[PDB]
Design a protein around this ligand. Structure first.
Ligand SMILES: *[C@@H]1O[C@H](CO)[C@@H](O[C@@H]2O[C@H](CO)[C@@H](O[C@@H]3O[C@H](CO)[C@@H](O)[C@H](O[C@H]4O[C@H](CO)[C@@H](O)[C@H](O)[C@@H]4O)[C@@H]3O)[C@H](O)[C@H]2NC(C)=O)[C@H](O)[C@H]1NC(C)=O
Ligand SMILES: *[C@@H]1O[C@H](CO)[C@@H](O)[C@H](O)[C@H]1NC(C)=O
Lengths: 213, 225, 73, 404, 404
């Protein structure tokens, strides 16, 4: 099989900018590439076939170039419609393997997240489990680091994060880190803290609570 | 005019079989070659299968991940293409799209891209049975603007609809995407930011609806000590 | 823009639809004029201006011979 | 192909008519008096026809004013010499072009009429704004569709007619038909039969009918616009288009050409390439990056330019046009298989679908009726022996009356 | 003659493809940046195709540097004016050639590309040394086979593609076939029948087959070198050559053309002249010193150029080519004498030897079946009138059953 490598996985750019995504292949595909555009939830769309040939109905801002091993997809002037995912596909021999993809986000001024912490409800503790929720509201860029500290003990293997899409109005992300524990372990300790690290924050913000309040 | 409609998706237990069927309408089905491409939830596109035209031998080409387990076929008499999924794993839970491979010319056994794409059908492979959700309040125990929410935990299968104040509250609401827990059940959280001064006057109730189990739960979210 | 083409294998032929017409149906005549001059001590420059006037007079003489045979097809 | 079916016309007849009008007395003075003030005017001749008039060069107001007073004489500056050369070069070049082309030149050179002068003439022509726009954006085509007839040089003025084209039909749908031989694919030599559609060329809708141009080489194409000339056309009914979707339609008798010459060839279309690969010839279609992407089987096939750059038939390499558009492949049984090669007319040029079918009806008469007269050779009887008694017919002989 | 058997191709399709590549954004900046130091360089476009690039004229570094500072303004040197004119004349003539030919010119003029620049491109083309030698000694022919497509004039640069030819097949044996009508020589007017070979044109060995050029007027000759174009050719098997030595060979069905128009003509060959003198036409062959040396008999004959200067057929005077070489006269019975005029198909275009033999075998079938069957049959036996009585044959007559 032939290995595909799309670079970069994420690209932040504004409207009207000139962007370039790269697709490296393991072999000489003899100009047998393909570029696809996939909007979230919808089916992908073939943009460029062969190496640079443009499919019918594709705007002139989409350019395909490269040869042999390195191939580039270029958007001359970005438009608000062009923010989606982009995949490269090889068509030399089977299998027609895909690339990892390149997520395209809207560039924005940096905004530090608003941190909230929610202890498990009394209704849930009576069932046997306990879920402590940490909320990072409206931040940029997407990259954010969250650690749970129970009585200053670092947790691992218990957090499970979830992030929303970029807001259609303010273009901000929102993250939800859920720490799941058992009722016995939850009632063993007393201090529970959420440490948030982000570019907008000069120092890591730690929201905490003592069990009981 | 040109349309590809895949059907036959849905829920299936790990280890059994399910047959997807792509109906083609708008062009000559016998002269063209068909392909199956899936996308796992949160993961990228993965090329799965490919069947060539009747003129080129009817040759089935599969990927390494599904070779020996999946089987592609076509019925040219009724313009339809099948993907038989046998010995299904939990990783096979994905959206399956039906595509048409475009030859390097009008007709050639060298293909340059995937011309037409179907809208896709969702296939969920899980051993878990239908279960309603458990809603728990995320109360603001801290004191500008405060945030509160609901925890919709342990439900199967997708999806669930969460609304605030029967649709009155919309601004500042963030319903996070579902996350599959280690138990095989889904769990999401839906939060909302409101001014701190409106807590003592206005009541906030989240309405969590789950049609696969007919479970509608309204949880009133109010603070504590 | 937005051009199609079809190939019919039954007749081994191809039709390229999608063009716009611009057929030449008729003619329009226009008369172009060049007004001439009735022209009937060697310094440095006069030799050149004299042979240039010779070019001019020979041109009008050759055109007088050419218009002699009114065109006809 | 069907260029012999065209009529014969005189191209410069109109300009020459205006020319013969310009020879009349006073006719030149009307123009010289009209352009005495401005450089462009509209003048109605004696016969009432109104024509545009233009004065592009005034050597009179140069030689008689700027050059005459110096002519004992002496030139003081050299700049006047180069100035005179620049003024006279145009007349020299016009004289050359006329003296070579016998007084009628085409296309109209820039010396005969510059772009500024040509655009001015188009701006003042008695036609629509759409026509002015069309002629102004395609001055290269207007130059190639115009003539320059030299008229007269009387009363210290030079005169030549510029015959400009009128585009009376604009923006109606057109289509170009390409054809190629469709032969059988047998293994024996000369046993194959061939059939070719002959109606190839340009077709354009015009006045409830179709204008057909059999020699597409004479039609000039720019962008999606087709500048053809009705002089090289045929006025056909609209039902001619049926021949593309149904060659066996009853409402129009489609024209074909039959033969037995199975040679391989290719016809490059607007969005692809037709390949007729017969015999031991090798025909392929290739892409500039990977190489050969199709090796054609024996027969007539098609390949779109979507991803194909070259098409090679035998020792001939064709580059396909890389124009953007959608190509659709319409399946169908090659009609040559519907025919019996034993009664197929192999010498047919100016033919049609029904003309060949009727020539087949006759051969079916000639063989099934008249040639089967051989069956009546041995099937009849000879005279019995002119002997004494009578004979009866037994077995295949006359065996008398013992049997009695 | 057989030019209709050829395909249809797009000549400038490759150059137009490269041209459309130059319309893309940034491509012009890549070209402009590559030639910032030298005047010629090799540039690979976005699609990977590598093309040579040349800057033949630099008006930017002349108008802005040597002309701009002088433009209070006053010109001091008069030589600088003529210098600017000499620099600008090339752009003016290039503009003329493009604006007349609608942007596509052929052959490539010296204004478009001088001899030094053309030899530079040939020297830097990535092909064999033998190809460089061939193209370098015959620049006039290379110009006659090249195009000049005007592309774009964007961002302070002018750009046009020069589409040069690649001669992939060199030094293989070629030969030119000349044909002329071969008619009978009867005294009656309409009694004559004619037959003519259609295989006339150029033939060249190429890749185990033969490239055939039916329109020999398009093939150019310099010395013993033949510059043809595969675009208007046909890929035939080698066995086609058999038609010269054995027209009745079975391995190739030679193409002929039958008629009844016995008119006199002459075909000037490479080293002689074929003369078809039919009817009361007087055809002679003469020498400039001695005079008439041969009065042709009625028929098709040949005359070598060794000592003959002119050949006259009727009122037509032909000059034979005086190239040095040996001409060989091969006697033989004219094949038209092998045919019977009563079963000879006279209406035949696009025919072959076996195609004539098939129609002759068919006509003889109807004749040998009609007259040999009707005569042997004619003397049969009629029947007695149907009167419910059985008749027996005796003495050539039908007698009723007279037995008791
Ligand atoms: C031939 O005619 C066609 C019309 O038949 C025409 O081409 C059209 O051009 C328009 C340009 O605006 C295309 O419209 C858009 O193109 C963008 C390009 O990225 C698409 O992304 C758009 O899809 C949007 O739709 C979603 C709906 O929810 C949006 O949410 C999302 O942001 C998507 O971006 C949209 O299609 C139009 O598609 C083409 N049509 C065709 C048939 O090509 C033009 O006149 C001619 N074509 C050319 C190439 O010149
Ligand atoms: C021609 O053939 C058709 C059918 O084969 C038959 O009906 C007809 O009588 C024939 N003759 C004519 C003159 O149409």
């Amino acid at each position: 099989d032939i290995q595909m490598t799309q670079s970069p996985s994420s690209l932040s750019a504004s409207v009207g900018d000139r962007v370039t995504i790269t697709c490296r292949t393991s072999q000489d595909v003899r100009g047998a590439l393909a570029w696809y555009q996939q909007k979230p939830g919808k089916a992908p769309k073939l943009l460029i076939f062969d190496a640079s040939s443009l499919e019918t109905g594709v705007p002139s801002r989409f350019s395909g170039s490269g040869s042999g091993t390195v191939f580039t997809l270029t958007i001359s002037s970005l438009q608000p419609e062009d923010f989606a995912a982009y995949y490269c596909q090889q068509f030399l021999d089977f299998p027609f393997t895909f690339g990892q993809g390149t997520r395209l986000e809207i560039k924005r001024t940096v905004a530090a997240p608003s941190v909230f912490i929610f202890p498990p409800s009394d209704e849930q503790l009576k069932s046997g489990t306990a879920s402590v929720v940490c909320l990072l509201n409206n931040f940029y860029p997407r990259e954010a680091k969250v650690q749970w500290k129970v009585d200053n003990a670092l947790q691992s293997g218990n957090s499970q994060e979830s992030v929303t899409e970029q807001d259609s109005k303010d273009s901000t992300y929102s993250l939800s880190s859920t720490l799941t524990l058992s009722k016995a372990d939850y009632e063993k300790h007393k201090v529970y803290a959420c440490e948030v690290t982000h570019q907008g924050l000069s120092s890591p913000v730690t929201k905490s609570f003592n069990r009981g309040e | 005019e040109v349309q590809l409609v895949e059907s036959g998706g849905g829920l299936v237990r790990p280890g059994r079989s399910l047959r997807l069927s792509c109906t083609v309408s708008g062009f000559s089905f016998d002269d063209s070659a068909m392909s199956w491409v899936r996308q796992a939830p949160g993961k990228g596109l993965e090329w799965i299968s490919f069947i060539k035209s009747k003129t080129y031998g009817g040759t089935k080409e599969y990927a390494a991940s599904v070779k020996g387990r999946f089987t592609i076929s076509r019925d040219d008499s009724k313009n339809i293409a099948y993907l038989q999924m046998n010995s299904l794993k939990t990783e096979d839970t994905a959206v399956y799209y039906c595509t048409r491979g475009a030859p390097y010319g009008g007709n050639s056994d060298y293909y340059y891209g995937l011309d037409v794409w179907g809208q896709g059908t969702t296939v969920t492979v899980s051993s878990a049975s239908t279960k309603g959700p458990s809603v728990f309040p995320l109360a603001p125990s801290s004191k500008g603007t405060a945030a509160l929410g609901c925890l919709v935990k342990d439900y199967f299968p997708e999806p669930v609809t969460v609304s605030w104040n029967s649709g009155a509250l919309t601004s500042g609401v963030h319903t996070f995407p579902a996350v599959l827990q280690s138990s095989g059940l889904y769990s999401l959280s839906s939060v909302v930011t409101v001014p701190s001064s409106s807590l003592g006057t206005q009541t906030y109730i989240c309405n969590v609806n789950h049609k696969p189990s007919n479970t509608k739960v309204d949880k009133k979210v109010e603070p504590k000590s | 823009q937005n051009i199609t083409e079809e190939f019919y294998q039954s007749t081994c032929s191809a039709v390229s639809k999608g063009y716009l017409s611009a057929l030449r149906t008729g003619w329009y005549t226009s008369v172009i004029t060049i007004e001439l001059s009735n022209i009937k001590g060697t310094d440095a420059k006069v030799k050149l201006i004299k042979q240039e006037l010779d070019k001019y007079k020979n041109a009008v003489t050759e055109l007088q011979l050419l218009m002699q045979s009114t065109p006809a097809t | 192909f069907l260029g012999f079916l065209l009529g014969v016309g005189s191209a410069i007849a109109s300009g020459v008519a205006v020319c013969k009008v310009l020879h009349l007395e006073g006719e030149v003075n009307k123009i010289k008096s009209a352009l005495l003030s401005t450089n462009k005017a509209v003048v109605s001749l004696s016969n009432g026809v109104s024509v545009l008039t233009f004065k592009v060069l005034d050597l009179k107001n140069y030689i008689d004013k700027q050059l005459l007073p110096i002519l004992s004489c002496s030139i003081s500056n050299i700049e006047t010499v180069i100035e005179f050369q620049q003024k006279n070069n145009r007349l020299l070049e016009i004289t050359r072009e006329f003296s070579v082309n016998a007084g009628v030149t085409t296309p109209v050179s820039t010396y005969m009429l510059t772009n500024s002068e040509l655009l001015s003439l188009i701006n003042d022509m008695p036609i629509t704004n759409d026509q002015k726009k069309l002629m102004s954006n395609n001055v290269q085509i207007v130059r190639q569709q115009s003539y320059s007839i030299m008229c007269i040089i009387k009363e210290e003025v030079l005169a030549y007619v510029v015959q400009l084209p009128l585009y009376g039909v604009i923006d109606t749908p057109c289509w170009k038909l390409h054809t190629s031989p469709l032969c059988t694919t047998n293994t024996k030599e000369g046993s194959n039969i061939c059939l070719t559609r002959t109606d190839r060329g340009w077709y354009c809708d015009n006045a409830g009918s179709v204008s057909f141009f059999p020699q597409a080489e004479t039609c000039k194409v720019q962008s999606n616009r087709v500048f053809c000339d009705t002089m090289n056309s045929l006025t056909l009914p609209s039902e001619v288009n049926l021949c593309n979707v149904d060659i066996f339609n009853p409402k129009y008798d489609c024209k074909i050409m039959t033969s037995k010459t199975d040679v391989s060839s290719s016809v490059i279309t607007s969005l692809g390439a037709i390949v007729s690969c017969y015999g031991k010839t090798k025909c392929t279609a290739s892409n500039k990056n990977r190489g050969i992407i199709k090796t054609f089987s024996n027969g007539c096939d098609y390949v779109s330019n979507k991803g194909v750059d070259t098409v090679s038939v035998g020792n001939t390499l064709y580059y396909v046009n890389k124009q953007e558009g959608k190509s659709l492949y319409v399946k169908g049984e090659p009609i040559i298989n519907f025919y019996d090669p034993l009664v197929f007319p192999s010498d047919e040029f100016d033919a049609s679908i029904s003309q060949v079918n009727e020539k087949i009806n006759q051969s079916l008469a000639f063989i099934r009726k008249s040639d089967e007269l051989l069956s009546a050779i041995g099937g009849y009887i000879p005279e019995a022996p002119r002997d004494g008694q009578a004979y009866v017919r037994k077995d295949g002989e006359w065996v008398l009356l013992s049997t009695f």
